[PDB]
């Protein structure tokens, strides 16, 4: 019962920090006084041990305690959430955390992983542990109505928007033929990671960043030169990822339901997600 857990750097759901000189994680409490539960997570810096904590790490710990299993956490090697791509042709393969789950490098994905049809054809998602959607992040001062703005629908090299490569947003814009004009712009500017994109907005190198509202709203509450706009437009949700043969599928989902019902998710949401 030693499960291989794969995750990804994505605040506030997963924080990644160096270990101390002795190879342990610095003890730390939140602003509200609760102990910060940190686990050792190996990943790229060759592979080195690092410290992981956050919403999703609290969730992992609750799940491993309820169903009573041990675990080891590592960061996805390519740093991506995961889409399906053709090889070279004929054969297709997933990348990112999706690829590591389906290949056996990981037994469970605990991350802000979006539930969609493309992925659900190959893996079992749990019930949502976080409901959210897509929104747009812009520098404070940039004015756009949302996803139907003309500067988004009739793009050009003057107003640049993008999302993260090999992600659910990339899928969402690539699968719908009616979103072909938008995707053709974004594929010229998509970023390797959400952190780079958000920094590029602050640097005025990117003008709009399309990403998960649970992440973008967090960022807006921290860096007050950034704002979201338009409200939601693709109400999705994050779920645990498992292979279809997993013997844990049932209890993971029951455990998530109970944790919504007893206020445990309310505790994590208030600790990691909500700010002002």
């Amino acid at each position: 019962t030693r499960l291989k857990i794969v995750t990804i750097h994505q605040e506030p759901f997963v924080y990644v920090k160096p270990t101390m000189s002795d190879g342990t994680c610095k003890e730390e409490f939140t602003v509200n006084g609760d102990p910060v539960k940190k686990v050792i997570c190996t990943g790229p810096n060759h592979t080195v041990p690092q410290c992981c904590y956050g919403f999703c790490i609290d969730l992992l710990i609750k799940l491993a305690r309820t169903m009573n299993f041990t675990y080891e956490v590592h960061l996805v090697a390519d740093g991506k959430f995961g889409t399906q791509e053709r090889v070279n042709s004929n054969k297709k393969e997933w990348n990112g955390m999706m690829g590591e789950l389906l290949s056996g490098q990981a037994d469970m994905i605990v991350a802000p992983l979006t539930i969609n049809n493309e992925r659900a054809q190959y893996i079992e998602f749990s019930k949502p542990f976080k409901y959210q959607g897509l929104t747009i992040l812009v520098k404070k001062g940039t004015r756009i109505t949302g996803i139907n703005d003309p500067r988004l629908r009739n793009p050009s090299d003057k107003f640049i928007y993008a999302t993260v490569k090999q992600s659910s947003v990339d899928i969402y814009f690539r699968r719908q033929v009616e979103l072909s004009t938008m995707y053709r712009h974004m594929e010229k500017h998509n970023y390797e990671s959400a952190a780079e994109a958000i920094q590029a907005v602050r640097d005025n190198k990117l003008h709009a960043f399309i990403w998960d509202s649970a992440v973008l709203e967090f960022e807006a509450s921290q860096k007050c030169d950034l704002v979201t706009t338009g409200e939601l437009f693709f109400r999705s949700g994050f779920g645990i990822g498992m292979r279809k043969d997993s013997p844990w599928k049932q209890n993971v989902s029951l455990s998530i339901l109970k944790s919504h019902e007893n206020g445990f998710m309310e505790d994590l949401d208030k600790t990691w997600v909500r700010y002002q």
Binding site: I115, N116, N117, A120, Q121, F125, K127, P128, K130, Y131, Y172, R175, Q176, E217, L232, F234, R235, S236, G237, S253, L254, L257, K258, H260, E261, N262, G263, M265, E266, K270, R274
Partner: protein
Amino acid sequence: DDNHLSIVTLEEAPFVIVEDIDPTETCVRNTVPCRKFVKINNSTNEGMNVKKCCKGFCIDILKKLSRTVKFTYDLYLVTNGKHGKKVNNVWNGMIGEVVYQRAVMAVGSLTINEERSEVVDFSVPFVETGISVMVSRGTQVTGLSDKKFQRPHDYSPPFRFGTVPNGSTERNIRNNYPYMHQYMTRFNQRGVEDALVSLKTGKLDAFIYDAAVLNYKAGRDEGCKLVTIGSGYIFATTGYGIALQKGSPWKRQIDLALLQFVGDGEMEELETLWLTGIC
């Protein structure tokens, strides 16, 4: 035959709306045939089946699922109960129909929870819900976990807020916020309509209820004076889902089709058609 599915639902507008047959003995417009066992009186199990016509948000989902998953169906309305409770260690309502194998699946405003999930398998949610709060436009409240609700005596004047008793919401508040529950009993409402009158007439400061239901009511409130909190503050988020028999061979295809509709924009088109209001 393995392709003709028995499917149960429950009248609950706007998710399921029941009308009568055409004055051409058939169901027309955007309605599908659905039967109902109509009791002879209130002190008997004797009854008769009656042809009806059903439509609504959930029915349009069922039409979408039928063309995509490629199954035919025979739709009928639940009579022994509503959505489903474990009464005398026996499940009634829509949950009962599925557990005791009278129905392959249940389509309606059925909330996914842990308790029901131990006897049925739910699909992925097609609509978010949870415990939400509705106030008059102008009232500053975050959500259920606001201190003005947990510790109402700490503020002057204290908030006056309540729910409808003997529902899921009251049960959840009783187990999570014991003092809030005790305080709310002197403000509980007979039903949704009496709550909304209480909010508008100034007798009540906040009404705590099902999230999807409050959004539907706020969207069509006369004068747009009643508003709900932001979705990010809904407590105990969950969804409405389709209940299937545990181990059902249909759950996978139902899920793939539902997730397609969310991605297709079809689900948004139905939301706009049936649930989105003028406000």
